[PDB]
Design an enzyme around this catalytic site. Structure first.
Site, mmCIF file in Angstrom:
data_model
loop_
_atom_site.group_PDB
_atom_site.id
_atom_site.type_symbol
_atom_site.label_atom_id
_atom_site.label_comp_id
_atom_site.label_asym_id
_atom_site.label_seq_id
_atom_site.Cartn_x
_atom_site.Cartn_y
_atom_site.Cartn_z
ATOM 1 C CB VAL A 99 32.045 38.996 15.216
ATOM 2 C CG1 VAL A 99 32.480 39.360 16.953
ATOM 3 C CG2 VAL A 99 30.978 38.337 15.174
ATOM 4 C CB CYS A 100 35.716 42.176 17.810
ATOM 5 S SG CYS A 100 36.444 42.987 18.851
#
Ligand SMILES: [Cl-]
Ligand SMILES: [Cl-]
Lengths: 226, 226
Positions: A99-100
């Protein structure tokens, strides 16, 4: 039981982790782990205190590994113990996910070499030096690698993993049980849709962090070049 | 500094809380509290361990109070200490908010009498006995009360609160910094869009909980009738 693990590190962006955790923990016959060097308290970037449940040495072989992002990614990109653990688990995992800015950790571990990947918009320039093919899309798959943008990327991709580990009806049931149907009141979640003045503010606020991460990324790339 | 408080209780649905927490903690000049009877560990319904930061007696006057949902709502609907705390804070708060079945706690506290409100789809029938006007919409405002559906309701309404406490540009900046632009891979987040077979499964799985909560709701309503 399907074994799912999240890396939990100091200065994590907790929602990157807690979102997919609650979705995946809703599935039958899963066990979810919060992994750090030892069990015990780990503080997120907001000050929220979370607890790691297992050490690197005691973690079982994982079917899914997920690397969240956050401020703390910079230290993790030069943590040889963490990078070795990620490499070991990725070798046999069915799904390697992030994520991210968690994808920058995968990059530092060598797992993006020749792979399509994304990361947070403000740090996207750091993917190419880590060997990736940068892609400006919210969820990018390449083989068993899934990288996603946005703080809630893992909620969405957790539903995809539910459908592929189980079936579509199971994923739909979890979505309905959680009544998950987002509707943001603004449309500024991408630099291509936000007002230019807002993009400028956000870029200025990230500039010191980007500068520091440019330096870290070059050292991480030098280690991969050896 | 704006004072924002979340009630943190055993068997909370942690994402109901952790979503808005990370958004609101990103704002300048806020202080966020995790409130229970005493500081210390509180276990969410998934097993995730969280830490409460303040007791009821030590909590400052709040500008925003948020009640998450979860399995643990049933006990909270008959906890006189918690209900009294919620009533005290709601009297002066600028915003009284809840996520999912957290609105049943507001109902038990007497704060929905004559008010439009929503809750989780499977428990929506419990609003009317608590004095509410039930509304089948994802976010329902009535004065300073905001009730929202879905596990990520608080992420979305946190952006609304950011815009009203600060300004729209600040809310847009937070959205962009978090790259928040959800795109679920399925469309089953409402009983009106999910397949009928999935709705049946979900309703069957909630039936025992609904039965128990019917009983609790009637006792809570009797206390309001006195
Ligand atoms: Cl997102
Ligand atoms: Cl939602």
């Amino acid at each position: 039981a399907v074994q799912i693990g999240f890396l939990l590190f100091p200065e994590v962006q907790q929602l990157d982790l807690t979102g997919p955790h609650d979705v995946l923990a809703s599935l039958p016959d899963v066990q979810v782990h919060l992994i750090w060097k030892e069990p015990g308290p780990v503080v997120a970037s907001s000050g929220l205190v979370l607890q790691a449940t297992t050490s690197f040495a005691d973690c079982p072989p994982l079917d899914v590994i997920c690397i969240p992002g956050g401020t703390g990614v910079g230290a993790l990109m030069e943590d040889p113990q963490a990078l070795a653990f990620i490499r070991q688990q990725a070798a046999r995992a069915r799904y390697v996910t992030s994520v991210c800015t968690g994808s920058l950790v995968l990059g530092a571990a060598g797992l993006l070499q020749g792979k399509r990947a994304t990361t947070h918009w403000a740090y996207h320039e750091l993917l190419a030096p880590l060997g990736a093919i940068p892609v400006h899309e919210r969820v990018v798959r390449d083989g068993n690698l899934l990288t996603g943008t946005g703080i809630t990327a893992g909620i969405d991709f957790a539903l995809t993993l539910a459908a592929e580990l189980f079936d579509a009806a199971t994923a739909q049931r979890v979505q309905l049980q959680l009544e998950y149907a987002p509707a943001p009141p603004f449309n500024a979640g991408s630099p291509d849709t936000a007002p230019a003045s807002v993009v400028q503010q956000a870029r200025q606020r990230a500039a010191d962090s980007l500068h520091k991460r440019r330096e870290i990324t070059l050292r991480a790339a030098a280690r991969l070049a050896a």
